[PDB]
């Protein structure tokens, strides 16, 4: 059993939190994190990008927190990745699609 | 880009159930049973598998595949690496059909893996390129 | 200073969890819970409906869907915040989320 | 339909800071905080306010029962206030109940609460002086009627 799952809020607020949870039977060696667009981890973004990541120190979890939200952020493809001893698993979301639904 | 996440104290054994250890000459060998390593996990901007460093827990000594050979650089695993490959980054992958066994591929030298090699009475950690090769299979104890 | 927000998964799975969280400035007297369709709390559903609720003792209530049917996918699912003011509600229809 | 969610130990006091208690004759009365039960247990003044979920959300549905009593729950049966012999139930299959009140913040005063009878809309718990006593009564609603305003104090 291996999977990665994103929970998103049904509506935008001033502080938006996306919750990424992985599920992996490789208990000591599994983790999740976010990639913004094609290839930027949150660590790589310029300061005040509006993105913050909270990686929880097997059900690995990483929350992505969006503040001062722009249209670029609303339309950005946001990916959560599960890493473990097997091929990486990804799930993604574009918020404007959820919020405009 | 590689960003450090979490580390784990680890005992590594080769295909013969021999434990990896560093000897007096600072050489990585395997013996039936200094033996405590740290496997540090990294997030990757280009997800290809589990990126790790291997360092000696009793530090600063980090495993390197520089120049297609095995060495231990005097350094700690870094907070980040601003590149998509590194002589100290290996991809840790489970063995097809054997979830309990792991292989470590050099990120710098694709197709090259950590291996155990018998040399006379000694068993040495080496880097090398035989499908199902057992010599590149390890178990990791946490 | 008062809100209710639902977090939903971007894709359907065998077990689906919807997370409802309330935020109220009446901290001693606030709770959230789910209403299925017009007026059924989870307790009122026929047995083995596929809906379960977990109330956390900010208030939280998770709604857990299993053996999901098309009626469940299209059901209006409402989370209610209760506190000393008038109830505040937020709702979701999962099929809208999943087909976007 | 009301479904019980959680219960909280509470003390209630009118705007004169007189505390609600149950007396030796099973009557809900108010006494000066000065003279209120001072025991850590506070058996005669500690109430359980039990919060209920509602199939028809109209406010915070609650029962009010005596914490130290085997089975004593406040009731508005017949437009009068008594301690009815029962415990707050797991559920009530009804949209109104003589033991359910809606706990609502006072208009313009978030820190104060009023308790509206679910059985008798527009009727509220009130503190009323009768001879030397201060009684808990049910009285019809006049905005800013201060006799129906309470402070609800957690544990």
Numbering used by the authors:
A (entry chain A): 24 to 80, 89 to 132
B (entry chain B): 1 to 33, 44 to 69, 71 to 140, 143 to 155
C (entry chain C): 24 to 80, 90 to 132
D (entry chain D): 1 to 141, 143 to 156
What wording appears in the published article?
IL18 is a pro-inflammatory cytokine belonging to the interleukin 1 superfamily and plays an important role in both innate and acquired immune responses by inducing interferon-γ (IFN-γ) production from T lymphocytes and macrophages while also enhancing the cytotoxicity of natural killer cells. Mammals and poxviruses encode homologous inhibitory proteins of IL18, named IL18BPs, which regulate IL18 activity and, in the case of the viral proteins, contribute to virulence. To understand the mechanism by which yatapoxvirus IL18BPs neutralize IL18, we solved the high-resolution crystal structure of the Yaba-Like Disease Virus (YLDV) IL18BP:IL18 complex. The structure of the complex shows that the YLDV-IL18BP forms a homo-dimer in a back-to-back fashion, with each protomer binding to a molecule of IL18, forming a hetero-tetramer complex with a stoichiometry of 2∶2.
Furthermore, a crystal from the complex of IL18 (8S) and a three-cysteine mutant of YLDV-IL18BP (ΔC21, C87S, C132S) diffracted to 1.75 Å. The two structures are essentially identical to each other with a root mean square deviation (r.m.s.d) of less than 0.4 Å, and the three mutated cysteines in YLDV-IL18BP are distant from the IL18 binding interface. Therefore, for discussion of protein:protein interactions between YLDV-IL18BP and IL18, we will mainly focus on the higher resolution structure of the mutant YLDV-IL18BP. In the triple-cysteine mutant YLDV-IL18BP:IL18 structure, the βE–βF loop is not visible in the electron density map, suggesting that C21–C87 SS bond stabilizes the local structure, particularly the βE–βF loop. However, the C21–C87 SS bond is not critical for the overall structure of YLDV-IL18BP or its binding with IL18 (shown later). The homo-dimer interface involves mainly βA, βB, βH and the C-terminal helix H3. It involves extensive hydrophobic interactions in the center (I29, H30, V31, P32 and V33 from βA, the aliphatic side chain of E122, V124 from βH and I129 from H3) flanked by hydrogen bonding and charge-charge interactions, burying approximately 1,700 Å2 and 1,465 Å2 solvent accessible surface area (ASA) for the wild-type complex and the triple-cysteine mutant complex, respectively. The lack of the C132-C132 SS bond in the triple-cysteine mutant complex caused the disorder of four residues at the C-terminus beyond S132, resulting in a slightly smaller ASA. However, the triple-cysteine mutant of YLDV-IL18BP displays nearly identical structure as the WT protein, and it exists as a dimer in solution judging by size exclusion chromatography and dynamic light scattering analysis (data not shown). Therefore, the dimerization is not solely dependent on the C132-C132 inter-chain SS bond.
